[PDB]
């Protein structure tokens, strides 16, 4: 009965690991900012956001070419493909662009923060910063958290806009559907406040979880060159489970 | 040590379930099986989307597929080959007398035998040798047609029966037909 | 004109980097196996495959609950939801289960191989193994490559089977559609050799790219405790771009 | 403290195994049968597309 | 009783019969 | 050797474009994959809803 004793010991440490990461979040956001805190947030928007711009724009095109090619092969048997422009822009705006653009943000810019704060912990830069008197949560961690909550909802819109334009390329200009019935099928069925705004609120709840996890794993490492790399797979797995987990809860509320 | 030899052996079991569930509870593999089938064929004047591997019905029951729809460019008419079945559509070992006792019933009737060329045993012996093998349930005055189920579904073939004193033997061309109707047909015929 | 000169120097090293990874693949697969090579492949199927079983089975359920809840909200306006069991099992079998289960394999078991072969390179275990005479490509790398090509197509089937069963739960047993017309809508429209086999061949081309990249990045590191962690984000990004890139090429061929 | 580290082991592995029966029950591969049912019959002349297990 | 036979039926009325009769 | 690496790298990408323009032709999505085609035309009075690539 050791394996059941080891298994129960595993999920007790993972439960108290949540409670440390909850108390770490209440110390960051319940504080008025220190002098100079906006100059570092603009710089941390460059590392997290702007470097992630190339992967999202390219991969957003490749889903749009697939959604236009799969939606045409199904809607041609029933002979109604004036709804092609609807189902492409309805799959992206409420479902795929909130979800897939959080599965690529957890990889590229999610795990990179855990390496960045993690390598500062093994090389004692975090411990050296505290003896000077500077608190490392306000100095290092907090400009990285606020640059994650802002930079992902700005990236699902670029994912959704490039995905529709890419879906317009293979649907209208390669397979040969009508251009005017493509766009006029959108404005009838796709509202703004029910679909585009509910695709943004779905990504703010996703941007909080892919950043609060990816910061806590790099702050509570164990300082070891092979203990860092084991916490970069702990933050890609835990982000992809909370994205798909809060997907169903937010879909049932918004579209139920 | 023995765990890593065992916890892979479980992983092949859970793959084994979830592959068997796909083939024989989701995909159509268990439902398609031609029970000792053969092949007949026909010629149509319109096949507007009769997709291959469709279904053929006699009375609203699946007794056949579709295999090839090519043109006949000496008449510019269609050519469809459908494989029916040999247990749902033909007369089996005991059933061979049921069509000779029906050939003697309505076909070899004396008021029917006295309506043709004069003999005593010409057709009377032919109904014992022609009717024994190479014979289906389809009476030869049954003309195949294209139909569709509902108003969105695919095209399927329908064999409307009736009458019939000889049966179609094997590989035979079904006599009459009618094409499928759509908007270019109906409103030009509704007047 | 330095930034243009630095940008051209970046993509020349990334082109040469492909040519090293191509010559590394021809040395692994063009060799008859050494004595004892099957005993390590069964063990490496435990690390890559069996440890990845929990994330795929749980996340496969959460997509099925979403596909049943979104497909019902659209198909109830047109009033035809005997096609609910078709579009759920057609979205998974040909499109989502080959793609999403490769975006979670690149994270969990993809990047873990790059940490595993990467930490053997900085701590000189690879250099020490060669002086004994044992070739580290045949000894260490090659049981990890063949355990990646096998373990992913066994995992997209478990992803697709759990996704349909999960979609049957929220469609039939919670929203109230007919159970018999759910299953009988599947066997009419979903073939085996055109849909289930073409969803497996799509994942063998995906399992080759998420493993040959994730092995090469951990073999050609630069030995440095913060040079390993920069090559674990290079292998999540490059895998997610080749999954979505070979998606459109394989979809156009199979369903065009 | 071992009873605390082992109560969580069982309470997980109940939930991990009882959830396999519920996922095997709703897949239709186990059971799916009525209570003391019977079987009538009727004979039609044209069942236009009446697949089995329809209501 | 159980196992018996209902014998009063009618068949399906399909559109290839209906629309051609609707003329 | 580095040059060798380079080469064996320009040969993968060039082969990677040879596949993308094979699988785009056999898909039907570009070019004309129907043999020895000859062209005819006609004169209508009203052709609604008729794009190219029709049947």
Author numbering:
A (entry chain A), C (entry chain D): 1 to 256
B (entry chain J): 3 to 193
D (entry chain I), F (entry chain K): 3 to 57
E (entry chain I): 171 to 193
List sentences from the manuscript:
The MlaFEDB complex is an ATP-binding cassette transporter to actively translocate the phospholipids between the inner membrane and the periplasmic protein MlaC4,5. The MlaFEDB-mediated glycerophospholipid (PL) transport was reported to play an important role in maintaining the integrity of the lipid membrane. In summary, we characterize four structures of the A. baumannii MlaFEDB complex in nucleotide-free and vanadate-trapped conformations using single-particle cryo-EM.
To understand the mechanism of glycerophospholipid translocation coupled with the conformational change, distinct conformations of MlaFEDB were trapped using sodium ortho-vanadate. Vanadate acts as a potent inhibitor of ATPase by forming an ADP–vanadate complex that mimics the intermediate state formed during hydrolysis. All three structures display bound nucleotides at the ATP-binding sites. Comparison of Vtrans1 and Vtrans2 to nucleotide-free structure shows the conformational rearrangement of the MlaD. MlaD hexametric ring rotates clockwise at different levels, whereas MlaFEB remains unchanged. The three vanadate-trapped structures of MlaFEDB reveal different levels of conformational rearrangement of MlaD and MlaE coupled with nucleotide binding and glycerophospholipid translocation.
